[PDB]
Amino acid sequence: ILPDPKFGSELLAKFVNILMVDGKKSTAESIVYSALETLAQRSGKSELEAFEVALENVRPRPVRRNALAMRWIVEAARKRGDKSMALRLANELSDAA
Amino acid sequence: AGINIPDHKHAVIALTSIYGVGKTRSKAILAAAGIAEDVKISELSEGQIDTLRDEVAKFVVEGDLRREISMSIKRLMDLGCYRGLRHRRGLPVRGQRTKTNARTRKGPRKP
Amino acid sequence: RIRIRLKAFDHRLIDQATAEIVETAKRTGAQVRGPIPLPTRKERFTVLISPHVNKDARDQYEIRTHLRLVDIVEPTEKTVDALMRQISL
Amino acid sequence: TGRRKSSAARVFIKPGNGKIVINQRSLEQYFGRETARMVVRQPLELVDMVEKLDLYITVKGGGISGQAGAIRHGITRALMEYDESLRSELRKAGFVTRDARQVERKKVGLRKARRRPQFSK
Amino acid sequence: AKQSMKAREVKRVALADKYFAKRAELKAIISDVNASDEDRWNAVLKLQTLPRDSSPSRQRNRCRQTGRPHGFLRKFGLSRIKVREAAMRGEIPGLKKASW
Amino acid sequence: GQKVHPNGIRLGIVKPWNSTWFANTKEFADNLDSDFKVRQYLTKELAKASVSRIVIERPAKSIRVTIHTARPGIVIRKVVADIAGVPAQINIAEVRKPELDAKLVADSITSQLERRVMFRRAMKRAVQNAMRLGAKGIKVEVSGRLGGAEIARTEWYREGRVPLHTLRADIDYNTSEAHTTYGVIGVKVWIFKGEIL
Amino acid sequence: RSLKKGPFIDLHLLKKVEKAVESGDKKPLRTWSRRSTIFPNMIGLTIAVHNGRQHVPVFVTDEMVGHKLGEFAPTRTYR
RNA sequence: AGAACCUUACCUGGUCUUGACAUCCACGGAAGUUUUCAGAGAUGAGAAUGUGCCUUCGGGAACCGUGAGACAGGUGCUGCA
RNA sequence: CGGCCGGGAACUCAAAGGAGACUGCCAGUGAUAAACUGGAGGAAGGUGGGGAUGACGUCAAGUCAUCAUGGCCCUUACGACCAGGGCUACACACGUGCUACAAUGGCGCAUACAAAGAGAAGCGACCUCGCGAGAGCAAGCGGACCUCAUAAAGUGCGUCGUAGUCCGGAUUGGAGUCUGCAACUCGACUCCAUGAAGUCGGAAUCGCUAGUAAUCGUGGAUCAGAAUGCCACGGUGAAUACG
């Protein structure tokens, strides 16, 4: 299991892994980079790196808790399109805050 | 003219809407007429449209293509060949498999 | 200049063949360089075993024909004697 | 020299202070996708003498991450032939190299290497 | 795979070897199209007077010792079962259990 | 259920092939046809000559056929020189141990069956003569209509040690078919000599 | 056909059409090589194709001058 | 691990039946080659040419045709021999 | 400024002969035994991975249709031949794949990366013609050199924007190209036009735990030509295994 130490964040490695449907890694990296760009508008308190309020979600081991949380996040993200590479992070921030 | 009135589309994509000219034929017509391939019809002036009308009417038009297809199929049917017989009975002509496939040619799967 | 190619089936067979060739080459002299082994050609093809209904039953056959060659910088009378004791001029 | 999923990689030591050229081209021109540079920077960051010494690399075969792993094994073999203390310090951390994870041979009677076809009752 | 079928095969390859040359010249003057429409017509004339046999279109190249029309290879010239038995009893160089 | 050939899996392990010649594709095809035709011809003309092994070698435009067998004073290259368009020569290897020969014991079993000797007696005589010579393993098997009745059986006898999942085992296996008034009977014989590789 | 060379017509059909022009009256023009196409000498003829078991006559005119012979007589049937 | 006639083992009409394929007997002719007509082709009738290697030269040896007896052929049946 | 040649056998590659990991060592557990866990060394640590390797017998399972054979039958025949047709037919259902139902998407431009295999009664450089399937010319190569042979997803720019729309491609018409005596039942491909159904699938069911599945491409056998099939190879590359 290799991480992505460009940003560290093995949780974001899991995120790009579950966003790597059909094995497309560079495109999922572009997706998470657009997500980082749209997240740097606010950026919270290191919110562009880690997620604090997104852990205790409305639909809940802590590793399995985070796995179910990110699964629900990806589901509610890919549920709609309309410039998905911003609408997915829009749904993410709506579910988080 | 009357037909092919889209909104916020490029010229080559717009010219596809006429029954008888599509993507590559629109590209060839625009190359012969000297028209850009990316300009929308709303930004396009009528000075190119009056030439485009004759440039497309040089080739087959909607009604002419429809009546040509109709006269060809009725000609083949009245000749009574294998093509005409399969066109009358609703069977494919190019040697497709009517055992399980050719549902689009045969009709709805009611029985 | 003069390239002598040879082919065999067994690895020890092609090894002893090239050994005999390089031994008679060191005998005749003329500064013969060593053997040049080339990558073998693998001729694989699957065959249905039984003549009836069985698709998972297919064998795997391997062909490993070893093809090597040696070089001669200048052909001489002793080299042609060691020849007449594949050729490319 | 090292390899990774059928991708040969040859290395050469040359002190250049930031000169990384692969196949007579810069790394930013030849490689890219903003992940290969990072996965080859990952050994270069902790213990690898990032400056004061550079490495001329050539690659043959492979794709992107395969060539990245091949040149990573190449630079760690260059470090090993340079000295042994840094090799031991790399092996103490999570940098054990030569990971043999090649592609499995296609089987017979299957749709892929480890995929049995669908069968009904 | 019968004696009659192998007789048909050997007479087919014999007629092919006999009438190969004139059929080859006919195909050559058919492929060479620069002029001589009437000579092309006469080439088709001779090609139609030539029987339908004696051509690689007729050449089926089935098995030799068994005559099996299915499961043939142009490298060994026999059936799948016969080349399997040949590699089984071991009278052909190579053909080991391929394992890579 | 369905095992593999011992020789067919140990072609490049212990027991070598019976043909040594290289050629291109069509040359390999016609040469295979020629060698199979001359093998069938030699077998059907010397079936009573106790023929065991036919090995062919073609270095360069020359056939060398060696017959590994016992009792060599039966025949004495005419037929192979007439059929093949290249020069050919014959050799005869009078090998020892005439009882440890798979083709010879298959011929003897088929001859006893066509002479209507009992199956158990024939198998017992075969395995006893095989083990008395000084062998290590012998497995015989008769298949098909054990008595000419309407029920077919596969009676097999073993003795000593006949391994099959050991690839370094010097095991030779041979099949034979006898054409009798009750059909055909297929005999499979296994001879295990030693353990060296 | 490859549509550049001569449209293939069989020799026996050619000579039977010649005999029909001479004295054959164009009625009993039985054909078996339906693989041959048609070219403008077959206008208003009565050609009997051997599509199935016997020969069935079909009138061929200028509206079907460029076509194939096996079209005008089918080989398929429904209940 | 491959249907366009072949494959083809099948059906419509024409054929040959010691046979398409292996062998025996007696006779004639080396073998072979160009080519025309009836015909969808299989098939029948012609017109020229070649005539050898050995010669016990009433004939050897492959080859083509004629007549009969053996047989042959069968992808016809029985894996419940 | 092409490994192109001198030069070198350093390195890759090539095929050989060997070596390298065998519970080899330490601690603990375990009836000191067998055996297990952790750790160092080590490229590989507990048969490293994969293929191959199929027990006595079961289904009187399939094959006398590839073949071999006891018996039965045809033997002016069910035997040999010939042309056309069928094997590709179509009220319907089932099975295995492929293409999609698009926005990690389509299309336009430039461009990065192989393994493996095949080739002479063939592959085909290179030029010209052609929007094209391809045609004329033709050196090299039964071959690590010559040819197949331009890999694509990816990268960089642009176009639209959530619609059957620029997704998708069935069907049909006109015209061409290839092999093949011959392309209509009964081939493939291409130029243009038409562009349908399809908007994520019910009860239910199948495969998969690793650089495997998932996705994209290439080659080969078969074959005159004719595969979404089969057999191999490569590119990117997951999540889960508490039980």
Side-chain angles (χ1 to χ4, degrees), chain F residues 126-127 129-149 151-154 156-161:
Chain F
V127 69
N129 209 5
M131 277 302 185
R132 188 251 317 275
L133 196 56
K136 279 290 302 304
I138 161 74
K139 177 178 182 180
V140 79
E141 183 262 359
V142 46
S143 177
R145 307 200 69 176
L146 193 74
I151 303 300
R153 289 170 294 184
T154 57
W156 51 271
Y157 280 161
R158 293 192 62 257
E159 195 56 83
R161 175 180 175 271

Side-chain angles (χ1 to χ4, degrees), chain C residues 3-38:
Chain C
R3 305 193 174 186
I4 315 297
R5 300 166 56 202
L6 74 162
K7 289 169 294 301
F9 292 101
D10 203 324
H11 42 86
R12 48 146 303 276
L13 180 70
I14 191 63
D15 192 14
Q16 63 88 36
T18 51
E20 172 259 6
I21 289 299
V22 75
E23 278 317 283
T24 186
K26 298 307 177 180
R27 183 200 307 177
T28 181
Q31 216 289 303
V32 182
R33 305 192 69 175
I36 301 102
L38 296 196

Side-chain angles (χ1 to χ4, degrees), chain A residues 68-79 81-82:
Chain A
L68 190 135
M70 69 180 64
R71 272 152 180 79
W72 276 80
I73 285 172
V74 169
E75 178 185 5
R78 75 181 303 181
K79 201 62 63 181
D82 304 280

